[PDB]
Design a protein around this motif. Structure first.
Motif, PDB file in Angstrom:
ATOM      1  N   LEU A 209       0.817  -1.218   0.000  1.00 29.83           N
ATOM      2  CA  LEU A 209       0.000   0.000   0.000  1.00 29.83           C
ATOM      3  C   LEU A 209       0.852   1.271   0.000  1.00 29.83           C
ATOM      4  O   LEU A 209       0.503   2.247  -0.649  1.00 29.83           O
ATOM      5  N   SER A 210       1.950   1.247   0.748  1.00 23.27           N
ATOM      6  CA  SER A 210       2.878   2.380   0.824  1.00 23.27           C
ATOM      7  C   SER A 210       3.479   2.699  -0.551  1.00 23.27           C
ATOM      8  O   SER A 210       3.559   3.861  -0.947  1.00 23.27           O
ATOM      9  N   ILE A 211       3.893   1.658  -1.270  1.00 25.44           N
ATOM     10  CA  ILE A 211       4.427   1.813  -2.620  1.00 25.44           C
ATOM     11  C   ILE A 211       3.315   2.245  -3.580  1.00 25.44           C
ATOM     12  O   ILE A 211       3.474   3.208  -4.328  1.00 25.44           O
ATOM     13  N   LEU A 212       2.191   1.535  -3.531  1.00 26.67           N
ATOM     14  CA  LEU A 212       1.019   1.860  -4.341  1.00 26.67           C
ATOM     15  C   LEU A 212       0.622   3.330  -4.186  1.00 26.67           C
ATOM     16  O   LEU A 212       0.438   4.027  -5.189  1.00 26.67           O
ATOM     17  N   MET A 236       9.617  -5.943  -6.316  1.00 27.08           N
ATOM     18  CA  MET A 236       9.228  -7.356  -6.505  1.00 27.08           C
ATOM     19  C   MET A 236       7.808  -7.719  -6.096  1.00 27.08           C
ATOM     20  O   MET A 236       7.205  -7.076  -5.232  1.00 27.08           O
ATOM     21  N   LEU A 237       7.284  -8.769  -6.730  1.00 27.11           N
ATOM     22  CA  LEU A 237       6.035  -9.397  -6.311  1.00 27.11           C
ATOM     23  C   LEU A 237       6.259 -10.212  -5.046  1.00 27.11           C
ATOM     24  O   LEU A 237       7.297 -10.862  -4.894  1.00 27.11           O
ATOM     25  N   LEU A 255      -2.551  -4.962  -9.720  1.00 33.60           N
ATOM     26  CA  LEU A 255      -2.093  -3.571  -9.656  1.00 33.60           C
ATOM     27  C   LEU A 255      -0.732  -3.355 -10.319  1.00 33.60           C
ATOM     28  O   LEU A 255      -0.535  -2.353 -11.011  1.00 33.60           O
ATOM     29  N   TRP A 256       0.200  -4.288 -10.118  1.00 29.67           N
ATOM     30  CA  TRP A 256       1.470  -4.273 -10.853  1.00 29.67           C
ATOM     31  C   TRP A 256       1.208  -4.380 -12.360  1.00 29.67           C
ATOM     32  O   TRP A 256       1.862  -3.723 -13.165  1.00 29.67           O
ATOM     33  N   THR A 257       0.221  -5.185 -12.737  1.00 29.04           N
ATOM     34  CA  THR A 257      -0.115  -5.346 -14.146  1.00 29.04           C
ATOM     35  C   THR A 257      -0.690  -4.062 -14.769  1.00 29.04           C
ATOM     36  O   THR A 257      -0.290  -3.693 -15.882  1.00 29.04           O
ATOM     37  N   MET A 285      -3.743 -12.175 -17.455  1.00 26.63           N
ATOM     38  CA  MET A 285      -3.008 -11.206 -16.652  1.00 26.63           C
ATOM     39  C   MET A 285      -1.669 -10.858 -17.309  1.00 26.63           C
ATOM     40  O   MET A 285      -1.335  -9.683 -17.473  1.00 26.63           O
ATOM     41  N   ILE A 286      -0.915 -11.892 -17.685  1.00 29.31           N
ATOM     42  CA  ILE A 286       0.393 -11.723 -18.329  1.00 29.31           C
ATOM     43  C   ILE A 286       0.226 -11.022 -19.679  1.00 29.31           C
ATOM     44  O   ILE A 286       0.968 -10.096 -19.999  1.00 29.31           O
TER      45      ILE A 286
END
Ligand SMILES: *[C@@H]1O[C@H](CO)[C@@H](O[C@@H]2O[C@H](CO)[C@@H](O[C@@H]3O[C@H](CO[C@H]4O[C@H](CO)[C@@H](O)[C@H](O)[C@@H]4O)[C@@H](O)[C@H](O[C@H]4O[C@H](CO)[C@@H](O)[C@H](O)[C@@H]4O)[C@@H]3O)[C@H](O)[C@H]2NC(C)=O)[C@H](O)[C@H]1NC(C)=O
Ligand SMILES: *[C@@H]1O[C@H](CO)[C@@H](O[C@@H]2O[C@H](CO)[C@@H](O[C@@H]3O[C@H](CO[C@H]4O[C@H](CO)[C@@H](O)[C@H](O)[C@@H]4O)[C@@H](O)[C@H](O[C@H]4O[C@H](CO)[C@@H](O)[C@H](O)[C@@H]4O)[C@@H]3O)[C@H](O)[C@H]2NC(C)=O)[C@H](O)[C@H]1NC(C)=O
Ligand SMILES: *[C@@H]1O[C@H](CO[C@@H]2O[C@@H](C)[C@@H](O)[C@@H](O)[C@@H]2O)[C@@H](O[C@@H]2O[C@H](CO)[C@@H](O[C@@H]3O[C@H](CO)[C@@H](O)[C@H](O)[C@@H]3O)[C@H](O)[C@H]2NC(C)=O)[C@H](O)[C@H]1NC(C)=O
Ligand SMILES: *[C@@H]1O[C@H](CO[C@@H]2O[C@@H](C)[C@@H](O)[C@@H](O)[C@@H]2O)[C@@H](O[C@@H]2O[C@H](CO)[C@@H](O)[C@H](O)[C@H]2NC(C)=O)[C@H](O)[C@H]1NC(C)=O
Ligand SMILES: *[C@@H]1O[C@H](CO)[C@@H](O)[C@H](O)[C@H]1NC(C)=O
Ligand SMILES: *[C@@H]1O[C@H](CO)[C@@H](O)[C@H](O)[C@H]1NC(C)=O
Ligand SMILES: OC[C@H]1O[C@H](O)[C@H](O)[C@@H](O)[C@H]1O
Ligand SMILES: OC[C@H]1O[C@H](O)[C@H](O)[C@@H](O)[C@H]1O
Ligand SMILES: OC[C@H]1O[C@H](O)[C@H](O)[C@@H](O)[C@H]1O
Ligand SMILES: OC[C@H]1O[C@H](O)[C@H](O)[C@@H](O)[C@H]1O
Lengths: 387, 387
Positions: A209-212, A236-237, A255-257, A285-286
C-alpha cells in the motif's frame, strides 16, 4: 534505453526479497545465496511452466561477491559459487533462460560487499559481458549524488561498448527521492531499461500500500515516462511468501499489471502453492502486463466508499480495469457504469473477469453493472469493444 | 463480575466483524443480519466440532432492532427476524449453545438503531432475561461520560435483579481511552465479565498490530486486572476472513491466547477452510486459552532482531511461550535459552510446539535452543516440568 531490450516489462525471478543476504550454507544449505539455489530455481522455471509463460530472467542480487583478483577483476564467493558465474550463465542459457546479476555504483553494495566504483565501471561491465550476463541491477549505496550522476551514464555506455545486449536496471532515482527536480526522467529513460523509484518492498500489505500510494500520488509525473524499453519499477512481487493473504496476492498482481510493472517474483519456487502459481501464471493477466503499447495505467476514480478504480489502455482499443477495495470490513457491492468511468459513447463493450474467466457482455456506457470486491482485494476486467 | 460466569474467557461467534450492518436481504439473503444467518451458524457450531471444542456463544451484534412496541419494549426487525428472539434463543439452546445480544448505553446504537437510554435500562434487561438471552454486549455510542458512569452500573444491577445469569460485556473503557485515571478497572471488574478496552478490530494485520502494541505498551496496568470472571477484550478473531495470511492468522490465535482473551470468531462458518478450522479448533491452544488460573500473559522480551517473546503462566507449574516475529523479510532462526527468558531453578522442562505438535525434551535453563519463526508469524510452546 535504446538497446532493443524490454519492449515489454521484464518477467522473471529475483533472489532478494525471499532469500536476502543468507550466506550461512553450513546451517542452511537449501536457502543460502549460492550456485545450488539458482540452479534449483532455474530447474523449476524450466520445468513448472514459468519460462513458457514468459518468466525468463533469473536474477542474482546482493551477497554474491567474493572479492577482486590481482587485476581488480570481480569474483564470486568461491565456496558458494564453486564453478563461477560463466558456469551459472551457461546453465541458465541451456534451459532457455536469461541471467541477471547485481552490482553497486559506490564503495560497497548495500550489504557491504565490494562496490563498483567509478574506476571499476568499465572493467566490471566487460566482466559481466564476458560472463554472458543478460541483465544488470545497479544499486546506489555508499555513493554521493555526483558519483551516481557520472556513474549510471558511464555504466550504460560501458555495457553498450561490450557489444552484448544487457538489460539495465537502475536504482539511481530511489536514492534521490524519486521525483523532480532531483530526478530527471527523460535522462533516465535514455540510459536505463527500468528504474527503482521508491522504497524496497517488504513482505507486508502495509509495504504494498505504501508503494502503491506513492506511485498513485505521483502518477501525473510517473505515468507518462513509462513505455517500451523504459519502465517504472515498484519492486518485486510478494506472491508466494508470508505476508499477503489470498485477496492481497491477487491485488498486487492486478495492480502491478495495470502499472505496466516488471513481474519479478521472489519466492521459493520449490514449494510454491498451486493457488499462488495460478495467480502468477494467469495467461490473461500476463497478456495485459505484456501489452505491446506499454502504456502505464492510472487510478481514474476514488470513492468515499474506499473503492478505487484503475485503468490501463491496451492494444486493439481494449482496456484493463482494476476495481480495488481499500475497505477492511467485508465484501462490497460496487455499482457503476462505463459512462461513469469516462468511456466513449455508442461503443458496445464486453468484459472478461481476469480471475474468474466470466464474461460480461453487451455493456454500453449507460449500462449499470455490479462488481463484488472483497476487502484488500480486487476485481479485474479485460474490456474490449464488440462489433 | 461475581455472577458465576466466564471463569475462563468466553468462546464463541459474533456477527459484527464479518457481516457488519448488512440488512439488504432482498439482494443478499444469505449474508444479511437475519434469524436465518444465526440459525445457520448455530447448525455449523453444533455439527462441525465448534460447540464440542468450547465455542458456545452465538452473539447477535448491531442492526437487529426493529423498534419499540407501544409499551416501549424492544422488538427485532419483523422481516429479518420473523419468528422473534425467543424462538432463536430456543433454537440456540436446543443445540447446546448460548445466545448473546447487543444493545447501546445511549440514544442510539453506533449504527443508529434504538438505544437503551437510562430510563430503558431496567426494561431492556428484563426483556433480554425473558427472552432467555445468555450474554449482553453493551456499547456506548451516542452518550456522555456521565451517562456511561450511571448506565453501565445500572445495567449490571438490572441484569442481576432479573435473576438470570447473563454474561456482561462492557465497552465503557473504550469510550474513555481505556486507561486510568479516566478508567477505573477495580469498578469494571466488579460490574462486567469482560470489557472492550480499545479500538474496533478491522480485517487487516495492521489492525491486529496496533491493538497488540497498545496492550503491550500498557500491560503493567492491564495484565493484573484480568482473571476468572473479568477479562480484557482486545476484540474479535479475524481467522477465516480476508485480511490475514496463514502466518498472521496463526499469530493472532497464539497472541490472543497468551493474553487470556475471549476467543470470539467472526467469520462465515459455512465456507471456512480446513486450514483455518485447524487453527481455531487446536485443542492444546484452547486448553491454554481456557487455563483455570486465568492469568493474563505478558511480553517478557524484545530484541533488535524484532523477535518478541510472550509468556503466560498456566496451571500445574506449566507456561505458554510465544515467539513472535515482527520481521518482514524471511524465516528467522531465533537462538535463546529458558534462563535468558527469566526461568529460574534447576527444573528440567519439556515443550510441545502448539502448531506442529513436536516435543522438545531435556530443556534446562542453560540449554541453548533454536526456533524458526516466519515473518509476521509465531512459534508457540506449551512448556512443562518433567520428573
Ligand atoms: C548501443 O547503443 C546503440 C545506440 O543507441 C544501439 O543502437 C540502436 O539500436 C536500436 C534498437 O535496435 C535502434 O533502433 C531501431 O532502429 C530501426 C531503424 O532505424 C534506422 O534509421 C534511423 C534513422 O531513421 C537510424 O538512426 C538508424 O541508424 C537505423 O538505420 C527501427 O526500425 C527500429 O524500430 C523499432 O521500433 C519501432 C517503433 O517503436 C517498431 O515499430 C519496430 O517494431 C522496431 O522494434 C528501432 O527504432 C537504433 O537505430 C540504434 N541506433 C544506432 C545509432 O545504431 C545499440 O543497440 C546498443 N548496443 C548494445 C549492445 O546495447
Ligand atoms: C447478583 O450479585 C450477587 C453478588 O452480589 C451474585 O451472588 C454471587 O453468586 C456467585 C455465583 O453463583 C457466588 O459464588 C459461588 O459461591 C458458592 C458458595 O460460596 C459461599 O461460601 C463461602 C464460604 O467461604 C463464602 O465466602 C461465599 O461468600 C459464599 O457465601 C460456591 O459454591 C461457588 O463456587 C464455584 O466456583 C468454584 C471454583 O473454585 C467451583 O469449584 C464450584 O463448582 C462453583 O462453580 C461460587 O464461588 C457468590 O457467593 C455470590 N455472592 C454473594 C455475595 O452472594 C449473584 O449471582 C448475582 N445474580 C445474578 C443472577 O447475576
Ligand atoms: C569511498 O572510499 C574512499 C576510498 O578510501 C577507502 O575507503 C575508506 C572508507 C577507508 O577505508 C580508506 O582506508 C580506503 O582507502 C573514501 O575516501 C577516503 O575516506 C576516508 C574515510 O572517510 C578518509 O580517511 C579519513 O580522513 C579524515 C581526515 O579528513 C580522518 O578524520 C579520518 O580518521 C580518516 O583517516 C580518506 O582521506 C579518503 N581517501 C581518499 C583516497 O579519498 C570515501 O570516503 C568513500 N566514499 C563514500 C561516498 O563513501
Ligand atoms: C441524546 O439525546 C438527548 C435527547 O434529546 C434528543 O435530541 C434532541 C436534539 C431532540 O431531537 C430531542 O427531540 C431528542 O429527544 C440529547 O439531549 C438534548 O440535547 C439537545 C441538543 O441538541 C438539547 O436541545 C436538549 O436540551 C437536550 N434534551 C434534554 C432534555 O436532555 C443529548 O444531547 C443526546 N446525547 C448525545 C451525546 O448525543
Ligand atoms: C442505473 O441505476 C440507477 C440506480 O442507482 C438508476 O437510477 C438508473 O436509471 C440506471 N441507469 C440506467 C440507464 O439503467
Ligand atoms: C549456548 O550458546 C552460546 C553461544 O551462543 C555458548 O557460548 C554456550 O556455551 C552455550 N551454552 C551451553 C550450555 O551449551
Ligand atoms: O542489499 C541488496 C538490496 O539493496 C537495496 O536495498 C535494494 O533496493 C534492494 O532491492 C536489494 O537489492
Ligand atoms: O540505503 C538503502 C536504500 O535502499 C533502497 O535503494 C531505498 O530505495 C533507499 O531509500 C534506501 O533505503
Ligand atoms: O455498530 C456496531 C459496532 O459498534 C462499535 O463500534 C463496537 O465497538 C463494535 O464492536 C460494533 O459492535
Ligand atoms: O463508536 C465506535 C467506538 O469504537 C471503539 O470502541 C472506540 O474506542 C470508541 O472511541 C468509539 O469510536
Amino acid at each position: 534505453l535504446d538497446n532493443g531490450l524490454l519492449q515489454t516489462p521484464p518477467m522473471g525471478w529475483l533472489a532478494w526479497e525471499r532469500f536476502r543476504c543468507n550466506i550461512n550454507c553450513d546451517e542452511d544449505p537449501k536457502n543460502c545465496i549460492s550456485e545450488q539455489l539458482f540452479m534449483e530455481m532455474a530447474d523449476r522455471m524450466a520445468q513448472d511452466g514459468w519460462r513458457d509463460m514468459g518468466y525468463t530472467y533469473l536474477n542474482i542480487d546482493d551477497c554474491w561477491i567474493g572479492g577482486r583478483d590481482a587485476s581488480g577483476r570481480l569474483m564470486p564467493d568461491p565456496k558458494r559459487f564453486p564453478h563461477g558465474i560463466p558456469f551459472l550463465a551457461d546453465y541458465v542459457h541451456s534451459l532457455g533462460l536469461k541471467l541477471g546479476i547485481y552490482a553497486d555504483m559506490g564503495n560497497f553494495t548495500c550489504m557491504g560487499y565490494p562496490g563498483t566504483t567509478l574506476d571499476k565501471v568499465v572493467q566490471d561491465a566487460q566482466t559481466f559481458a564476458e560472463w554472458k550476463v543478460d541483465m544488470l541491477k545497479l544499486d546506489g549505496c555508499f555513493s554521493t549524488p555526483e558519483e551516481r550522476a557520472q556513474g549510471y551514464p558511464k555504466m550504460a555506455a560501458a555495457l553498450n561498448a561490450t557489444g552484448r545486449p544487457i538489460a539495465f536496471s537502475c536504482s539511481w532515482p530511489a536514492y534521490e527521492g524519486g521525483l523532480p527536480p532531483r530526478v530527471q526522467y527523460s535522462l533516465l529513460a535514455d540510459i536505463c531499461n527500468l528504474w527503482r523509484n521508491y522504497d524496497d518492498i517488504q513482505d507486508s500489505w502495509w509495504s504494498v500500500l505504501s508503494i502503491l500510494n506513492w506511485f498513485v500520488e505521483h502518477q501525473d509525473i510517473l505515468q507518462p515516462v513509462a513505455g517500451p524499453g523504459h519502465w517504472n519499477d515498484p519492486d518485486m512481487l510478494l506472491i508466494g511468501n508470508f505476508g499477503l493473504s489470498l485477496e492481497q496476492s491477487r491485488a498486487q498482481m492486478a495492480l502491478w499489471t495495470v502499472l505496466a510493472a516488471p513481474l519479478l517474483m521472489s519466492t521459493d519456487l520449490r514449494t510454491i502453492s498451486a493457488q499462488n502459481m495460478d495467480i502468477l501464471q494467469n495467461p490473461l493477466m500476463i497478456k495485459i502486463n505484456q501489452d505491446p503499447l506499454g502504456i502505464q495505467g492510472r487510478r481514474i476514480h476514488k470513492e468515499k466508499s474506499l473503492i478505487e478504480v484503475y485503468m490501463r489502455p491496451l492494444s486493439n482499443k481494449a482496456s484493463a480495469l482494476v476495481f480495488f477495495s481499500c475497505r477492511t470490513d467485508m465484501p462490497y457491492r460496487y455499482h457503476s457504469s462505463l459512462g461513469q468511468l469516462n468511456f466513449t459513447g455508442s461503443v458496445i463493450y464486453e468484459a472478461q473477469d481476469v480471475y474468474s474467466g466470466d464474461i460480461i457482455s453487451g455493456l454500453r456506457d449507460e449500462t449499470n453493472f455490479t462488481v463484488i470486491i472483497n476487502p484488500s482485494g480486487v476485481v479485474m476486467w479485460y474490456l474490449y469493444p464488440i462489433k
